[PDB]
Design a protein around this ligand. Sequence first.
Ligand code: 8JF
Length: 154
Amino acid sequence: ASRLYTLVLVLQPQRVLLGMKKRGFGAGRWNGFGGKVQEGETIEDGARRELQEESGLTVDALHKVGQIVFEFVGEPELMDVHVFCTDSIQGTPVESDEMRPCWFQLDQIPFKDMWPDDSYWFPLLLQKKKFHGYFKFQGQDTILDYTLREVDTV
Ligand SMILES: CC(=O)Nc1cc2ncccc2c(-c2cccc(C)c2C)n1
């Protein structure tokens, strides 16, 4: 009862790229770039594809940084999200009907307009730590319970 997703963070030494989602799941928040892994597709290939579709950027090197499972009470399917980061990209970010990308200085990450769990694991991401997390949500705004631990192997 878990569905595979990817999430990609473009993280450079002084800034991170986030995309304001205009519609659908996560609309109105600054998100990384991700989505469902397809049939016959590797998780990493899925991550590379989502980054291109949503941001217009071509990734070169992708690095595994975490796994987060999300539970929404009242929803049977868990999201099994494989989180990646990259500092090595081609292209310039593209604004589309679906997504408005913007660069943020690392001290100006807009956590109040991001998914609430980001506040918990972004600090780890920023310091190049790897992690496993689980967040139980009620609706899209309330974290009921969570676990988060650093790991050596994602
Ligand atoms: C920084 C960031 O994006 N954080 C972030 C936080 C999330 N929190 C809860 C559920 C999903 C989240 C997602 C997410 C992950 C993969 C696919 C999709 C559609 C979404 C909404 N991303």
